[PDB]
Amino acid sequence: AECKYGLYFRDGKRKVDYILVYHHKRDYHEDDKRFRREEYEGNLLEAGLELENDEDTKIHGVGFVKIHAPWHVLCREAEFLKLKMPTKKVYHISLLKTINSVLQKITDPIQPKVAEHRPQTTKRLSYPFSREKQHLFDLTDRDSFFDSKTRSTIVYEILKRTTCTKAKYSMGITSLLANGVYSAAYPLHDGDYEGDNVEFNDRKLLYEEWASYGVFYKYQPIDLVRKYFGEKVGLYFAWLGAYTQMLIPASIVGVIVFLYGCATVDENIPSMEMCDQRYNITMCPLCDKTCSYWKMSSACATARASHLFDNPATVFFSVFMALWAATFMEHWKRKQMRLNYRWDLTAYFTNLVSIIFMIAVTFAIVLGVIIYRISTAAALAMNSNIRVTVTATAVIINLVVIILLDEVYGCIARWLTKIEVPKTEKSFEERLTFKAFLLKFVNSYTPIFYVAFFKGRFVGRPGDYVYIFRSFRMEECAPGGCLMELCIQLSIIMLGKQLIQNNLFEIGIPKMKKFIRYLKLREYVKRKQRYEVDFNLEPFAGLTPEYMEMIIQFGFVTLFVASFPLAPLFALLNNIIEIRLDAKKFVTELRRPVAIRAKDIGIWYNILRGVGKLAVIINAFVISFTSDFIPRLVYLYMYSQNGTMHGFVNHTLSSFNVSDFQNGTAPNDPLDLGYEVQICRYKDYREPPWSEHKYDISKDFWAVLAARLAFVIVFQNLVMFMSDFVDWVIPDIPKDISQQIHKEKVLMVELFMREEQ
Amino acid sequence: AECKYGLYFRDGKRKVDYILVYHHKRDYHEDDKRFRREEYEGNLLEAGLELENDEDTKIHGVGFVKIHAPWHVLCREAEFLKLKMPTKKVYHISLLKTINSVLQKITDPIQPKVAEHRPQTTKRLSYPFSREKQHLFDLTDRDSFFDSKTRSTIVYEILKRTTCTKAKYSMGITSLLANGVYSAAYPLHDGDYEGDNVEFNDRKLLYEEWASYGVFYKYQPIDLVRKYFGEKVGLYFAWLGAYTQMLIPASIVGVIVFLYGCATVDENIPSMEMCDQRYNITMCPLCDKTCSYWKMSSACATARASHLFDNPATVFFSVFMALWAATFMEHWKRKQMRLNYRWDLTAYFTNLVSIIFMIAVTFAIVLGVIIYRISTAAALAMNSNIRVTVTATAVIINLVVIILLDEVYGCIARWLTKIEVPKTEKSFEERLTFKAFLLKFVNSYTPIFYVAFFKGRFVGRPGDYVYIFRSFRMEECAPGGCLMELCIQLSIIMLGKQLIQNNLFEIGIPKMKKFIRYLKLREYVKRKQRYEVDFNLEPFAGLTPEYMEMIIQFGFVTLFVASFPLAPLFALLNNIIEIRLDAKKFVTELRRPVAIRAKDIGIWYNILRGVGKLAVIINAFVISFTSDFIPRLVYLYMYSQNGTMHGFVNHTLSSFNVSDFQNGTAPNDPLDLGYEVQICRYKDYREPPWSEHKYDISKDFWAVLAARLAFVIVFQNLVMFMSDFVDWVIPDIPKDISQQIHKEKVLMVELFMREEQ
């Protein structure tokens, strides 16, 4: 009623800045905990904080404690730290400008409706606040001089300072919370976000203008977000928006490159030769005692589909995407400085744990191939087009096991970090992030490397096959090739796993917790107090998973772009929804976090710059050994009489005598095709049967292998030099930002004169 | 007499801090210059400097001006800048230590005899000096509170501040010196360095203990050098000593590697097969219409000598020298911080000039090959063993032309820098250094790249040769190979050009200037004054050539070490003499420079880190395409029946029919050997005459080319990762240095309390 529902004290003039809750159930350890609390409350009273208790609530066995801070305490704690406040001093801000004017005219309807977005040609000064010189800062209003966030930060620092006499080593509220004496501690929200009679506050404004699905095409009011939540939350959203901005130019060139291949697919000689039914090309079986001879005309659709994923445009696109990320890094580096300026921020256990971590990483690498092979075998056995359905089933089966193993890997990393004694609090996080990221990388990217580089390459020749354990034969690729399975894997992963299931789980997880709480608790007419309302929300976890998700997503776009031009387009649609999906959680679901000052994102910059450096070698090897670019180039300039591409499929096929088959390897029935077979054909570079040295490696095997090796040498060096040049050219600091500081310092000289004046 | 020979004023209590000399010959422009001087002297008097003139000297038409500074001017100018002075506050400094104690016991006789080298367990504080708080610093003695160097620095700053009313734009003494009104300006030396009755001063101490040839095995007293000369000179000598220290461990492994090859030269099968006289192997002529057939047994000495320069030890040494420099960089980076802590230092014209510079660089690259070819032709024509003498003559002839072209390149760079307007004084030097370094690099390293990679490789086959301009045939390599000329070139260069002629010219150049001055001037009983004595010395130039010489020397050790194990040993002998050669010049020859504060060497770090990065690719290519390592490895594992090295020379030789020679290419007389010749042999991979496709590239040509290509791919990546790991592991800041600052700051808190106390 007169207390505005728990926001103020009983007298109505003291604002609650923090809330402590203890489990006072209606017993020697309980008495000891009570004595410790009482001593802590006495120390807090000695510090200079007003104290209050409430014991009459509907919830059983809970007590709430209110904390308040006076004016002199706030002044002293603000002067102790380096806190900058606005000053009455005001200065004016001091062809190419008409372009900015035109774009400002055009971009008017998309800007949000907030007070700060109004242009300001004058900016006030800012000087450290201290008790010695109070004339420089206007102290007209005490209430409006301090925001709620900076009011709660000082109280949190005071709570961290306090130590208990009984436990001299134990300091701060963290140890008390860890022991189990207290339950939780949290600041209060400003008010409601919905309601017809609700008065104006920042929560409702951010709900209407920022956290909604109907305003997905607007900008974000970053200043209000930083004012309400803090400087650690704002940098994440700024980085997300900057990352989302740079995908629009990259999502158009990929579409153009993809569309170029659809128009020129009906004039492709290699794909036209395979689909012709005038020849009678019989191929050898692909398995032992079960399969039989087939025909080349049965892979026409796969041959036609493979054309859209390799051509010179797909190499030009790789060269382009090589420089795109180098430009993005410089863009973010230059953007961070403006935000820094505007926000006024200018032994044996260790070795043993490291060895165990390497062992675990090796085992995690090992298990994935076994899981993939088992999934493929199960998918093949379940069925009995066939191939596409079998591949899709195998991928879908493997994804679930990956999802299940992620959590176990995370728990293992957490326990491994815990068993080793951490020196401080920052090193704990800096080590946990690395330990989790390595395991997530090796868990996510293992099956892709196997199909691209290792599947179907070490299998033998007809008549001399390779067996493992003397009883199992190595598997081969698809009849059309192994470039089609990679595209299906990438498409299925990117479209389903990262877009549908992830977001559905994110939305649906809190509902089960709410339902469980409702079932366990078991109407309300009187209005509950603020602390009782805030007690039913979910506590804040952190920002590590939010960064980890986007960092994992960043690797798919760059590492495997040489054979998938549509990768950048799939990420933009997800990033469009992710911003407004994450915005709602902070406003409507979680509890209010405390503010932390930061000047950079932190350790993720090094990870991004390592992935960007790693992408190039993989791109070069994928272009060299997975496609048919180099064989075509070699055939055109060495073996063609015309100078054209006639006879290329004729060139790449060998011959074999079906009468030389090993015992127990011939097909069961050779008359399914309807005619007798005497010679089958396979893909390799070996000698003909009608020769002195049959089935031997020929001279053309060695000529293509040097051409594949030289391409990597040229590509790697050229791309590395081009990537370094871009960093060299662009400066790291904007000119206007650096210019503005010098005049401010020149006037700050007279400000220093004003200090004694 | 009573003035101590010009050191003090006539009264005997004012010390001369600077000296200005004008050309007052015994005429309107002369009157204008006199008026300008007079105005400058009036401005200096307004500044607060005492002035004096002397016009009675033996030298004709010269006048000297004396400058003196009072105490209050010194105090004000010292408080204007950030100058730190010692304080009365004193603190104590706060298994592994016994090793340091033992090495201190052993290294006693090699330490110099100076006061500062005595161990000090207590170190005084240091606080900014200001007029507001003079109680913290003891002002007991005015004379001993300021050194001569810091006394002259303030006067130089005052002179730079002064501006002339008539020329408002012109400021400082630099413009006056450039116009021609004044001749020179220099501070004074402390006194003499030789003499039985000479009193003690720092010049004599540095002469006896530092700048001498009989103390070449001792340390250097860096603190006294910095106290007398400054902080810019000391860093050069510290870097030189640190660079000289790290060559001792590297000069022993090279000797061991070189000695390993001498013991195993009598069991080498490939060199034993060539020296055997049981076979009769006739080779084809190496030139048109003049040479004739020769025998393989005539290159036995060259074959035996080539063994000492390639073996697995020469690859292990390359891998070792890859990490040596990475360790050296970290060593210097960690050493700089201790010196920083101890010394209290904690539009269209531009584009046009750039294009002209690229054109000049291209032309400079072009001219060197022509010069080398002309020198080789002249050396061959002059004579008429023959080969060794001809090669030595060609190298000696080329070196002189290189020496002559260096100065023209330097002058071109200077003019090119001058024609473009520089923005400031630092950018001028930073651009001139780069412009000179690029031209010196391309001038020095051009002939080495040509012999290693391009000579004798694009020449044709017997019966189908390659001609340029339809009349000139391409040259071939030496009969034994092209690995012997590179060693002779490197040895001759390193031993003669950098060690004998350079030092002789450095010593002998000032003597010609002294003799010319003596001849032009034309005895003395009275003692000359200090300014008249200092007027006859040579002015100081700078530190760019001193750094450039050592930077150029640094490239020979690292870039071309894969085939010359004795390179690090030749540089140590030169660096031993260079220190004591350069020390004498500063003490006995040049004028006294003014002090400049610096915290790093500057732009040379980037050049060193670029050369270190560049060395790896060149090393890999030199190992792959210049030696015979890969062919031997290919022969051993693919073509040998034994499993040994029997029949390798048999493998690498082809055959040719002497009856298929082109018209005008057969030798004049084929009967010099004493018997008829029907088949000659050459080195290549081609088909035999008794085949369907004669003189065609065979299958063994393509098998070795892939093996040469894979080695580079493996080597480059492995060495790059290993080089990055070393930087990753080692921290960049010493632990004790960082630890010491925190306690000093903790006590500086009480020092701040002492400020008001």
Ligand SMILES: CCOc1ccccc1OCCN[C@H](C)Cc1ccc(OC)c(S(N)(=O)=O)c1
């Ligand atoms: C593609 C890269 O090149 C190689 C590089 C390095 C080593 C081997 C390489 O080559 C791959 C071998 N894979 C053969 C070329 C394909 C093939 C196709 C059909 C077959 O018939 C069923 C058989 S098989 N098992 O009968 O030989 C083999």
Ligand SMILES: CCOc1ccccc1OCCN[C@H](C)Cc1ccc(OC)c(S(N)(=O)=O)c1
């Ligand atoms: C050594 C690297 O390999 C090559 C790599 C790339 C291209 C060509 C390469 O090979 C070099 C060719 N140089 C031949 C192999 C040497 C030779 C020796 C004696 C001769 O007789 C006088 C002749 S010649 N002019 O008569 O052919 C040639």
Ligand SMILES: *[C@@H]1O[C@H](CO)[C@@H](O)[C@H](O)[C@H]1NC(C)=O
């Ligand atoms: C070629 O294949 C067709 C496919 O039906 C078959 O009818 C025909 O008999 C075959 N001819 C030969 C010569 O194999």
Ligand SMILES: *[C@@H]1O[C@H](CO)[C@@H](O)[C@H](O)[C@H]1NC(C)=O
């Ligand atoms: C290509 O070769 C075929 C057969 O050798 C011939 O019919 C055709 O005309 C040739 N095409 C061109 C463009 O030379």
Ligand SMILES: *[C@@H]1O[C@H](CO)[C@@H](O)[C@H](O)[C@H]1NC(C)=O
């Ligand atoms: C395939 O190549 C062989 C080898 O020259 C040739 O004889 C055969 O006719 C070719 N096949 C076709 C269908 O052209």
Ligand SMILES: *[C@@H]1O[C@H](CO)[C@@H](O)[C@H](O)[C@H]1NC(C)=O
């Ligand atoms: C290989 O095939 C030919 C027919 O092409 C046949 O005559 C010969 O007998 C076969 N080889 C063997 C070993 O049977």
Ligand SMILES: *[C@@H]1O[C@H](CO)[C@@H](O)[C@H](O)[C@H]1NC(C)=O
């Ligand atoms: C082999 O060379 C020696 C060298 O003098 C010569 O005397 C001898 O006649 C030669 N023999 C043959 C067969 O060429």
Ligand SMILES: *[C@@H]1O[C@H](CO)[C@@H](O)[C@H](O)[C@H]1NC(C)=O
């Ligand atoms: C090497 O081969 C030669 C001739 O083939 C033979 O005399 C010799 O014994 C072999 N050496 C070994 C170690 O096998």
Ligand SMILES: *[C@@H]1O[C@H](CO)[C@@H](O)[C@H](O)[C@H]1NC(C)=O
């Ligand atoms: C060199 O190789 C050929 C080819 O096999 C062989 O006939 C000849 O005997 C060899 N020469 C010697 C001296 O062994």
Ligand SMILES: *[C@@H]1O[C@H](CO)[C@@H](O)[C@H](O)[C@H]1NC(C)=O
């Ligand atoms: C090549 O040499 C053989 C002897 O080795 C000779 O009989 C033949 O005539 C020669 N070739 C020609 C074109 O003369």
Ligand SMILES: CCCCCCCCCCCCCC
């Ligand atoms: C009143 C709201 C009308 C618009 C609703 C839009 C819902 C979200 C659609 C987002 C689509 C973005 C491209 C995939």
Ligand SMILES: CCCCCCCCCCCCCC
């Ligand atoms: C800073 C917030 C940006 C939010 C994204 C706005 C929507 C962009 C849609 C662009 C469509 C391009 C299709 C190729």
Ligand SMILES: CCCCCCCCCCCCCC
């Ligand atoms: C018998 C020939 C079959 C050819 C198949 C070609 C497949 C093209 C699919 C295009 C899908 C585009 C979706 C955006």
Ligand SMILES: CCCCCCCCCCCCCC
């Ligand atoms: C943004 C820079 C793009 C540069 C693209 C260079 C690659 C061109 C490849 C051409 C292949 C031609 C095959 C016949």
Ligand SMILES: CCCCCCCCCCCCCC
């Ligand atoms: C607002 C501007 C930010 C920086 C934009 C840089 C260029 C964007 C286009 C991508 C270029 C890629 C070249 C390979």
Ligand SMILES: CCCCCCCCCCCCCC
């Ligand atoms: C961060 C601002 C970026 C401005 C555009 C930069 C585009 C790329 C310039 C360098 C191109 C290098 C081509 C080899």
